[PDB]
Amino acid sequence: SEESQAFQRQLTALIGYDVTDVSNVHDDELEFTRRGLVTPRMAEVASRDPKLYAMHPWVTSKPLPEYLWKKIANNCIFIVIHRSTTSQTIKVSPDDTPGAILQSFDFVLRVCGRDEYLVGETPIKNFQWVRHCLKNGEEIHVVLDTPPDPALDEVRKETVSLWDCDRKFRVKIRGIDIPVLDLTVFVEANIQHGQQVLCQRRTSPKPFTEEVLWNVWLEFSIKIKDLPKGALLNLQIYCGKVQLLYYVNLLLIDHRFLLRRGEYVLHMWQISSFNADKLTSATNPDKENSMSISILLDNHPIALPKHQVRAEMPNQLRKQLEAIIATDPLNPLTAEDKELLWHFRYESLKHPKAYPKLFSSVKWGQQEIVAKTYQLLARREVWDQSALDVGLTMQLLDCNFSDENVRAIAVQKLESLEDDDVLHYLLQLVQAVKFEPYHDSALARFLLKRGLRNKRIGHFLFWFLRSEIAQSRHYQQRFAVILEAYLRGCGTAMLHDFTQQVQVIEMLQKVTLDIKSLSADVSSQVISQLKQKLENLQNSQLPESFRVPYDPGLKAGALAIEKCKVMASKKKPLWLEFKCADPTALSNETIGIIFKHGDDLRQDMLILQILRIMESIWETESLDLCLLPYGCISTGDKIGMIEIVKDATTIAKIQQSTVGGAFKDEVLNHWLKEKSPTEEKFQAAVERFVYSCAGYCVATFVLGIGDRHNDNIMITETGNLFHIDFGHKERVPFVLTPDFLFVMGTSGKKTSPHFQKFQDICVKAYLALRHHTNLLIILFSMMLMTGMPQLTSKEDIEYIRDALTVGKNEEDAKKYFLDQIEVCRDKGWTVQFNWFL
């Protein structure tokens, strides 16, 4: 192929991994998957409306909430339209379509300052930019523009059956080899499906030298016909109480439905226990330093075939079944429970909420049972007609399920998600790719086609996939195949966008890392050295304008060198500021970004996303708790960017300026007054604080991250509180300190008008989250598994069960949470003071 040479290396520098490389494979799954994704790519590319794809209108079909109607005066909003020098203002009703305003004044209404458009058949109240304005109380400024050319979006032109085999499965362990290393060592071989271990065998313990041989057949009790698709041979290495040092995995049935055969020399992963890294079919790329195991699967090709009633039951049984279905997802199922669910299979099928539990009662090491299960899936009318529950759907995409048909019925439910909701779960859906047994899956193809069908989903998919590719040896190959698949259909315009973005951050990360080296306080020298490189970059070869990765609407321009600094933190992050590249912008506020190496911003990404989910949960119940979940992208290993929230300082530094060093109550409130221009704006600031505080109180308690040092809480000059830095004796539920309480109007032990309102919001916020207990549990589980490097135990996850008081009735839980506030009215500054040491 000709010009494809430069285009492929163009893709490689965008992805940050060579997709064509074959040095770290032992089959053709990755390449098969590239070829496999061509069709779903072509199918989506060819069927999208070229023009709607260009203006990417960001819209929603949810009701406009209670808290936003009371903002509209007399069923009429104001839209300032802009010509050249001066503007004109028009009055419009919440239902007026973009078209119904094109007459009153072919042209298109682009937002002032942003690459966002108001086009297409949706009411203007249904546009997100509008709901943003209304929320913060801001004027809607648009410009009369020419529609962007769809030509810019142009895409570059492009035999023995298994069930006839009653033989027992066997695998030969030749031995383990390690280039460099006193105990004994054995190998453990597990047949696995999900995380259920079907069969297990061990070798005898040999002395741990740099090469160990066994040459033994481990005969299993499971038969070849009884092996289900997606079953992992999991080979582990222990020494010796025993300890696990190395693990590795191999799919027994391959992507062609063929039983795995022949010689394999698999390089293995180390340890430092539920962790998504432990499930991967990928092998260690580090050939020179890693341990390896050598095996033989001896066996005509043995292909796996593709598959082509009671409802009357006793009283106490039906109730026992419903008690089982009405438990949380973390509640374990006994043998008796499982045996019950399977027998009444068909009664269970009528309840969508039974599905996780029901498919966790299947004996996957039994061909005739799985056969009955597939027949059971062929009759899923009730599931098919049910309204989409994301939390139930999530459950079926986690580590406990490895059956493609089971997982496909979940991915079926996600199809009905409007693009606004995909964005709400995209991060967690992307991470859920780690639980897929195979590189080609419904879930992967779903992400692929939702990204090709939408520039916004497409933008965030890019960085989400890129984040993991840059810092996951366990999953970089898989995500890389998917990302390439996406880029080969996103269109020339975006490819060029992505190139600028990659080039800018790769440049700025260098400057971030160089500066960190040069410090042992913001010393005289460093100040000028940073400004040295930042003026070096302004001409060669930083493109004059790039999209903000955490806010794809915003074009950033030239560095405001004067305003850039290194910060007085121990990790020396950058404080960078940019002119807005758009001359049609009506502000002059710079775009502030922090670049930081040192923290794990993947954890920050996840926690932030969950916060956005809690916000939308509250929207369903007409609540707004004014959380500030700022942009944060993980660009690499322990490195990324953060949005600078304008006009904000930490709590501790407010306590520093009055004292310097503990601790005074009124400080905050008289800091608040000295930033309010009126008195009206001051009480609005007290109001924003009442909600803000309550918001982070509820959210952090549930997540178990409420007990925090107070230079990790921030506030804006308009009262908006918010936590930061989510990287990683006697305790406290959350941070309700006596200075917070003084703002609400209380001093010691009283109930002020504002403090009641606080308790009012908290209680409602908490119980609102409890209406989504299941969903939060799964999100939280998934987060711990794909985002925390901690070999997360059951006990780490069982925290949120307690926090959300599962089982407890509505009344009893409200009093449980009010106990919590009262424990904050017991320690005051004692926990804060303890940090100081």
Ligand X SMILES: N#CCNc1ncnc(-n2c(Nc3cccc(O)c3)nc3ccccc32)n1
Residue 644 binds ligand X (CB under 6 A): yes
Interaction between residue 526 and ligand X (CB under 6 A): no
CB 407 within 8 A of CB 395: no
| Residue 639 assigned to a binding site | no
Terminal alpha carbon distance of the chain: 65
From 49-57, 104-112, 121-129, 643-651, span contacting ligand X (CB under 6 A): 643-651
Region from 272-280, 591-599, 688-696, 755-763 binding ligand X, contact rule CB under 6 A: 591-599
Nearest CA to 574 out of 524, 636, 644 is that of 644
Quote the least distance from Cβ 723 to ligand X, whole Å. Answer: 8
Q: How far is the CB of 569 from ligand X (least distance, A)?
A: 6
Does 365 count as an annotated binding residue? no
Q: Name the residue nearer to ligand X (CB basis): 218 or 628.
A: 628
Q: For residue 581, give the 3-state DSSP assignment.
A: coil
Least distance in angstroms from the C-beta of 91 to ligand X: 36
Sequence-ordered list of residues with C-beta below 8 angstroms from that of 210, at least 6 positions apart, any chain: 177, 178, 179, 180, 181
SS3 for 243-307, per residue? EEEEEEEEECECCCCEECCEEEEEECECCCCECHHHHCCCCCCCCCCCCEEEEEECCCCEECCCC
Is residue 646 within 8 A of residue 708, CB to CB? The reply is no
Among 449, 478, 596, 814, binds ligand X (CB under 6 A): 596
Please report how close the Cβ of residue 87 comes to ligand X at its closest, in angstroms. Answer: 30
Q: For ligand X, which is the closer residue by CB, 390 or 601?
A: 601
Helix 315-325 crosses helix 335-343 at what angle (to 10 degrees)?
Answer: 110
Query: Which of 28-36, 299-307, 542-550, 593-601 is the region at the interface with ligand X (rule: CB under 6 A)?
Result: 593-601
Tell me the residue type at 166: D
User: Shortest approach of ligand X to residue 789 CB, angstroms?
Assistant: 17
CB of 127 to ligand X, least distance (A): 27
- Position 646 contacts ligand X (CB under 6 A): yes
Q: Taking the complex as a whole, how short is the minimal distance between the CB of residue 7 and ligand X, in angstroms?
A: 37
Residues 144-173, interacting with ligand X (CB under 6 A): none
Q: How many residues bind ligand X (CB under 6 A)?
A: 17
Q: Which of residues 695-724 bind ligand X (CB under 6 A)?
A: 724
CA distance 551 to 271: 37
What CA–CA distance (Å, rounded) separates 554 from 581? 8
Footprint (CB under 6 A) of ligand X, residues 599-618: 599, 604
497 assigned ligand-binding residue: no
681 is in an annotated binding site: no
Considering beta carbons, is residue 92 or 724 the nearer one to ligand X? 724
Concatenating the DSSP letter of every residue in 739-791 gives: HHHHHHT--SS---HHHHHHHHHHHHHHHHHHTTHHHHHHHHHHHHHHH--S-
600 is in an annotated binding site: yes
Residue number, 537 or 724, with CB nearest to ligand X: 724
Q: Which is nearer to ligand X, 55 or 642 (CB)?
A: 642
On whether 631 is known to bind a ligand per the annotation, the reply is: yes
Contact flag: residue 726 with ligand X (CB under 6 A): yes
Smallest gap, in angstroms, from Cβ of residue 674 to ligand X?
16
Using the minimum distance from each CB to ligand X, give the nearer residue, 341 or 714: 714
Query: Is there a contact between 551 and 592 (Cβ–Cβ < 8 Å)?
Result: no
Q: Give yes or no for a contact between 358 and 340, defined as CB atoms under 8 angstroms apart.
A: no
Rounded alpha-carbon distances, angstroms, from residue 831 to 316, 654, 662, 732, 823: 51, 18, 12, 7, 11
Please check if 634 is assigned to a binding site: yes
Q: Tell me the closest approach of the beta carbon of residue 776 to ligand X, in angstroms.
A: 21
Q: Which stretch binds ligand X (CB under 6 A): 144-152, 485-493, 644-652, 654-662?
A: 644-652
722 is in an annotated binding site: yes
Q: Per-residue DSSP letters for 662-679? A: ---STHHHHHHHTT-SSS
Identify the residue among 645, 705, 797, 818 touching ligand X (CB under 6 A).
645
Check the annotation: does 796 bind a ligand.
no
Angle at 719 between CA 715 and CA 724, to 5 degrees: 25
CA-to-CA distance for 114 and 584, rounded, in angstroms? 9
Cβ closest to ligand X, residue 306 vs residue 728: 728
Q: Is 598 annotated as ligand-binding?
A: yes
The least distance separating ligand X from the CB of residue 629, rounded to whole angstroms, comes to 10
Structure tokens at 224: 């070849």
**Is residue 593 part of an annotated ligand binding site?**
yes
Exactly one of 203, 584, 650, 683 binds ligand X (CB under 6 A); that residue is 650
| φ/ψ (deg, to 5) at 700 | -70, -35
* Residue 725 within binding range of ligand X, rule CB under 6 A: yes
Rounded to a whole number of angstroms, the minimum distance from the CB of residue 567 to ligand X is 6
Main-chain phi, psi angles of 336, to 5 degrees: -60, -40
Nearer to ligand X among residue 126 and residue 603 (C-beta) = 603
Task: Note whether 671 binds ligand X by CB under 6 A.
Answer: no
**Distance of alpha carbon 587 from alpha carbon 112, whole angstroms:** 10
Residue 836 C-beta: closest distance to ligand X, Å: 17
User: Could you give the strand order of the β-sheet that contains 648-650, starting from the edge strand earlier in sequence?
Assistant: 648-650, 713-716, 721-723
On whether the CB atoms of residues 664 and 656 are closer than 8 A, the answer is no
Residue with tokens 């509209």: 72
Nearer to ligand X, 147 or 631 (CB): 631
Hey, is 617 helix, strand or coil?
A: helix
Q: Is 748 annotated as a binding residue?
A: no
Q: Do the annotations mark residue 595 as ligand-binding?
A: yes
Taking the complex as a whole, how short is the minimal distance between the CB of residue 638 and ligand X, in angstroms? 12
264 makes contact with ligand X (CB under 6 A): no
Nearer to ligand X, 632 or 732 (CB): 632
Is the CB of residue 578 less than 8 Å from the CB of residue 593?
A: yes
Decide: is 578 part of the binding site for ligand X (CB under 6 A): no
- The reply, when asked if residue 630 is annotated as ligand binding, is yes
Contact at 8 Å (CB) between 498 and 462?
yes
648 is a contact residue toward ligand X (CB under 6 A) = yes
Determine the Cα–Cα distance for residues 833 and 827; give it in Å rounded to an integer: 10
User: What is d(CA 29, CA 774) in angstroms, rounded to the nearest whole number?
Assistant: 35
The torsion of the CA quartet 555, 558, 562, 567, rounded to 10 degrees, works out to: 50
Least Å distance, CB 625 to ligand X, is 18
Q: Do the annotations mark residue 50 as ligand-binding? A: no
Q: Does residue 541 have a cis peptide bond before it, meaning omega lies within 30 degrees of 0?
A: yes
The answer on whether 346 is annotated among ligand-binding residues is no
Residues facing residue 302 across a β-bridge: 160
CB contact at 8 A, 577 and 591 = yes
Which one among 647, 666, 802, 810 touches ligand X, defined by CB under 6 A?
647
Segment lying near ligand X (by CB under 6 A), choices 191-199, 250-258, 267-275, 646-654: 646-654
Distance from C-alpha of 728 to C-alpha of 117, rounded to nearest angstrom: 39
Interface with ligand X by CB under 6 A: which range of 197-205, 524-532, 647-655, 745-753?
647-655
52 binds ligand X (CB under 6 A): no
Judge whether 727 is annotated as a binding position: yes
Among 264, 359, 486, 630, binds ligand X (CB under 6 A): 630
Strand-pair partners of 541: none
- Residue 560 interacts with ligand X (CB under 6 A): yes or no: no
Query: In this chain, which of 171, 465, 613, 642 binds ligand X, going by CB under 6 A?
Result: 642
- The interface with ligand X within residues 487-516 (CB under 6 A) comprises none
Minimum distance between the CB of residue 601 and ligand X, rounded to whole angstroms? 7
| Binding stretches for ligand X (CB under 6 A) | 569, 594, 596, 599, 604, 630, 632, 642, 644-648, 650, 724-726
Q: Which residues are annotated as a binding site?
A: 592-601, 627-635, 722-728
Q: Which residues are annotated as a binding site for ATP?
A: 592-601, 627-635, 722-728
